[PDB]
Amino acid sequence: RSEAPLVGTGMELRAAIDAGDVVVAEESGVIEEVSADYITVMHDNGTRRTYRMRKFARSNHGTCANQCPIVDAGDRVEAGQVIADGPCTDDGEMALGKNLLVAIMPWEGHNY
Amino acid sequence: RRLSALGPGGLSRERAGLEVRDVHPSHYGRMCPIETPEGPNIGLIGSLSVYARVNP
Amino acid sequence: GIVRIGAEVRDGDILVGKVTPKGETELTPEERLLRAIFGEKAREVRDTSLKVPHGESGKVIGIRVFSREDEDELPAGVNELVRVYVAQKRKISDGDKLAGRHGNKGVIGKILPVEDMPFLADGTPVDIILNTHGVPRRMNIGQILETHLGWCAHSGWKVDAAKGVPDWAARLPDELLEAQPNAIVSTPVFDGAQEAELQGLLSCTLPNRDGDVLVDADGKAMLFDGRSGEPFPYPVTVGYMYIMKLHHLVDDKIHARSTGPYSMITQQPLGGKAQFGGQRFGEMECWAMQAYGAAYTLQELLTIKSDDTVGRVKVYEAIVKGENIPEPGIPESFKV
Amino acid sequence: ATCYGRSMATGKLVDIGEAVGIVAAQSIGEPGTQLTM
Amino acid sequence: DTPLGITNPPIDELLDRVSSKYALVIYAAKRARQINDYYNYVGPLVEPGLQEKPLSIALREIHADLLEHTE
Amino acid sequence: WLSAASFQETTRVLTDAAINCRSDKLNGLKENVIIGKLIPAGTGINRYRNIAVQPTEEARAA
Amino acid sequence: EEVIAEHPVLLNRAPTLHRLGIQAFEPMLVEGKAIQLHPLVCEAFNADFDGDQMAVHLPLSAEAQAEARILMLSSNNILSPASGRPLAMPRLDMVTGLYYLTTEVPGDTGEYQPASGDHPETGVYSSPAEAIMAADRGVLSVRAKIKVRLTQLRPPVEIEAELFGHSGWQPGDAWMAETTLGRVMFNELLPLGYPFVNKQMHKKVQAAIINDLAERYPMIVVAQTVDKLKDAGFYWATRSGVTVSMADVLVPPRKKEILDHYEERADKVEKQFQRGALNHDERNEALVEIWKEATDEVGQALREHYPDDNPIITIVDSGATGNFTQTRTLAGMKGLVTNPKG
Amino acid sequence: LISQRPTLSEDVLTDNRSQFVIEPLEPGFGYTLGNSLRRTLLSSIPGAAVTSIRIDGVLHEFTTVPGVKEDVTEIILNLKSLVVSSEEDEPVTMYLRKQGPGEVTAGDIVPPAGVTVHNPGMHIATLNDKGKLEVELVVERGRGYVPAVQNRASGAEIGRIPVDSIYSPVLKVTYKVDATRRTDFDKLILDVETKNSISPRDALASAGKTLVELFGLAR
Amino acid sequence: MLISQRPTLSEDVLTDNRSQFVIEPLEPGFGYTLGNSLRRTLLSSIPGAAVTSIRIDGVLHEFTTVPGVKEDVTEIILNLKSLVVSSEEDEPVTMYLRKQGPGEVTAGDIVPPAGVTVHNPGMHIATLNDKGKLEVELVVERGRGYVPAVQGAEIGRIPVDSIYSPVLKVTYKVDATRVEQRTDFDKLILDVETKNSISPRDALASAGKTLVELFGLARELNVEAEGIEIGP
RNA sequence: CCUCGA
Ligand SMILES: [Mg+2]
């Protein structure tokens, strides 16, 4: 599970969509169908667009490239909205780690 | 978005002096001064700056 | 002969059975007795099957096979081509590498029980303990500033706007005078949250469910040692820090070898964990051994653990039979 | 041995078989990276 | 005090028993492979213990002055 | 000549050693390393490697 | 666990810059996939734990195992073979621990205050055990000056000479010391016959003590001492209170006026250059001198403003790790910067 | 300066959270006592959880189910939030059959006699028209946290998906002591919050009897 | 079966007043779960008798010296706190130490009232020079742990630190030695040195009893499942 | 060799 930082910049989002590992709505519409396998968008044009999800693909360096939808059936999506998350993205933004509760102190030499 | 220094028709590694690897004043806004490899490829592999763009 | 989809595999498990025709002269005396006794009469082969490499394991999640009997583009001479995809769920472990965004890297020394971890006044144990000695020396005080803001965004805040707008909050956008717990915020580089604005938010931190302010206006808190129960005598900075999992993980890097393949020219052990290689006891390491004056350790490393093709075998032979280790022969690389 | 002095490692006088040349080269090299202009 | 494992017996008394650390290494190693040859030729000369490596038995022998060496 | 060839400038050392029909005594540490012999230092010098170890008769009694 | 018992292994970290870059250890079977490296041999390997890896070699023959146990044993290589001084001393965390343990706090809890009128002095303790019980209530601080009856620790040179024979002191003999309970517990970690050191254990003082231990005591003794010091240093460092926060990073108050003054001087030099009187290289020289001095003065005001128990000051001045120009760059001011040409 | 036998006194805050006042205690002792209780509560309170699961058209974790929105991995992460109790002390099986469209929550699970699902609103999956989910969930009793028992150790067949088990019913424990300075004394206040699997009283009772059986050693 | 094996409790006797106790093997984390608690109980919750205050006749004004006596006041108090004593009276009880002439006063030179006892009569207290006398009164009470000398009165009444605890020093550590299938268990080592009132054994036993009662206070809320062992 | 790790 990916988790965007509490403390970020405005660069996570705009880097995640350009990186291209997220799925992005080419045209505005309504979600007709949504599985873990694909997402269909009925544009107001009357046409349909469908985006098959990369499911548990092997990246060049052995990390899991697993897309996951973040829309629901019936949702109104605009052009360029993010439909589905990628490997290190959370709701369209780059999520490279987790927010961890930290104490800054020495502890019995185990953080020596 | 990388900007590599080595290659055919470029410079070779035995010719990689210390000065091609320095942050040049002209890099401002074009090649990021922070992102570069720690090891041997330092100053040889740099990445394009945010708002930068290449002309024809 | 291909492993079945969904299997759980471990070191040395067959994934694809394969046999390579060896000549008759390559049958061992035993393999030649059983073949004659039971009259196998099938052409003699060597077990050249694809196994699971040392130190890895997982679920077979995908099989992909290409045949020459089917019309399939293969390289010349290649009849059948099959890929097995193995997936492992990797829990964070001792030796895995973590870092924040400020160049503050470290590997994991110990994963303690939740009860042993220093915990806040409400029982919440901390997740990660970063040593104080590492921060100031390395000039990445950004991690401390982040920790402070990380706590502010986790707890949420409500800036006192009653009498007006305090001087520190003057330059703050209206959408930042209050924030719900676990709020999401930006610190743009060179245009981020200034020191005064940050120190203000540490005052108006919303409390937890019991009305308690766990982190004071300095960013420090009182923690209990979960081993003794006694409190730690001074307030510790606690807060929320973004910590990434870097791709330098023990599972990839642990490697060991008693005996394995050897390069054909030199007869020395191959290199690389992937090839089940041996570690390189190099020039500066021989100087070290020499400087100690460890003559026999230096000889043994350089003859029977590497290059003496007969002494190798004689040594494994000796250990298995509980005898003394024999005398070194001549390194094959000197012959070369 | 008497001319060399104590073994810096052991603190007692240097033993007979010691390879003091390699130790000396190592002792001179090891901090060389600290040498700047 | 009373050190554990490899640091026992102490290197200092074992070095009282010999001239240099190198002589001690050879002393102990030759006695150790002597012992191991015995198990398939004299010794051991002390109570060996549960399952002790012959090198450790030999080091304890050298400590207890239970054997002699030349050069 | 073996030590010189293994140090650097190997072509030159080897050429000259050939013309001079040099014979390597194989005296040094590096040379015994290359051929896989016990180096002539530490536990490899003769006064230490040639130690005779036997038990005292007082101990052999018990 | 049976076969590996007492069978040494060699550990190596590259680059092997000197022979202590390879050291033998007794292996302890461990849970996990990582090698566990004693915190005191780090110096010898130049090993930190930011991702470093290390190599393991198994000596097979009796001679190789014997060379490993005798020549290369971790605890038999405690001194730098380059300088002859010990390398396996406490480093940074241990340091802040022991420096915390043995600092004396004027006015701390349970401090001995002499008898005034009818009130007693309430600072004397019949034994360090009694002082331990006192500190188990909130009554005695570890760092408060007190008077204790010491029974099993050797007294200083002159105290022993005056209250006994010059060289005579038996382990049973008692004596009175005005020290801290911390310095008691520190000296208890040193070897027995060692004269009581009653000082704040700066790193340099620990270095002095361990250099003395190296000169006067056998190898194994110094090894056991640094192990005990390590334990105490980690415990007390955890208990020490050193932490970084934006608040602990104090700013020098006069910094504005200092910098404005040196800017006035730089303006003088610039007007001097515009007249053609000052040379360009000479202008740069004068400006660099001005700003060197401004940096120096900012650093001085920074030191003057920091309380001497601030965790940053504590960490630097204990000798644990870091220097003050790092502190000046953090809190005061960065200063002048190099050119690509230098 | 004499002794009075100490009392434990409960004060219920919510249905799954209670405070516990133990007084009087020896000075300097409250912290250690509270912590010896908490460390046991956090670690050794018995409970029940799911061990393995089986899914109809699924042979392994890393795949999808037709018409469901969540891949099997996300479904198992959601099943990690499942809080459950059992009194059988032998592997028992729950079942989950449902056809879309609609949400699949823990209330849609049919446990056997003796197993109780405690958070029925908990979201498990989302189904559409073509979505059909058919799940078996083995429940067992244990304590602590036990990583997935492998398909090799158990004689499990390829279809079975082992799952990480969180048996602890305890959610969050803290304490505070009030120290009072001739006759000084410490009053301990434990604060225990559970997962709805059991109540603070029962968790504290199991922790207390584990500690009693363990301290009866010296006596 | 949700039941742990029975750990053992073994002894190493160092001196007549000092022992190390090993509890092993304990389920992971319990070394500390009962480590600090056992120590704090051994220190604070064992009853003993000790000196509370003293009146020294012959000096009230100076409160520094005792005429004809080598040792000063503070040293006499330090020696008196070192007196191990056991009483059955729930009320304070007074003792008297009187000895004259050049000699060496010991802890046997005191007359113990009924019920109280002095377990270290050989203890040095003071040395009286020629024409030297000593008459000093010692209040003794029952108590627990360690309470300081803090406790408007009759003149000459010096209150002292009361070392009630029969145990003197306790320190514990946790190592890892475990079963072959888990290899993460806790071995607990307790170093306890006591006075001569009780052996370390009895100290540990009474501490275990007080703790069993303490946590029975908790198991009394309800009686149902929790981890047990085959043997105690 | 390339990219990376200390
Ligand atoms: Mg490093």
Characterization of the model:
- Chain E: It is an enzyme of class 2 (transferase).
- The structure is cut from a larger assembly and holds three copies of chain A, three copies of chain D, one copy of chain E (71 residues) and two copies of chain H.
- Chain A has 112 residues and is mainly beta.
- Chain A contains one helix and 13 strands.
- In chain A, the strands form four sheets. Chain A has a four-stranded antiparallel β-sheet, with no helix packed on it. A three-stranded antiparallel β-sheet of chain A has the order 2-10-8, with no helix packed on it. A two-stranded antiparallel ribbon of chain A has the order 6-7.
- In chain A, strand 4 (38-43) and strand 5 (48-52) form a beta hairpin.
- The longest helix of chain A is centred in the first third of the chain and has 9 residues, at 11-19.
- Chain A is elongated, with a radius of gyration of 18 Å.
- Chain D has one helix and no strands.
- With 71 residues, chain E is mostly helical.
- Chain E has one domain.
- Chain E contains three helices and one strand, in the order H-H-H-E.
- Chain H has 219 residues and is α+β, with helices and mostly antiparallel strands.
- Chain H has helices spanning 30-43, 72-79, 200-215, and strands at 7-14, 17-25, 47-55, 84-86, 92-99, 102-105, 115-117, 123-127, 132-142, 145-146, 161-162, 165-166, 170-180, 185-194.
- In chain H, strands 1-2-14-13 form a four-stranded antiparallel β-sheet. In chain H, strands 5-9-3-11 form a four-stranded antiparallel β-sheet, with no helix packed on it. A two-stranded antiparallel ribbon of chain H has the order 4-7.
- In chain H, helix 1 packs across helix 3.
- Chain H is elongated and about 75 Å long.
- The relative contact order of chain H is 0.26.
- Classes of the chains: A mainly beta (112), D mainly alpha (37), E mainly alpha (71), H alpha+beta (219).
- Chains C and G meet through strand 9, helix 2, helix 3, helix 4 and helix 5 of C and strand 3, helix 2, helix 11 and helix 12 of G.
- Strand 13 of chain A pairs parallel with strand 10 of chain C.
- Chain G binds one RNA strand of 6 nucleotides through residues 13-15, 46-48, 50-53.
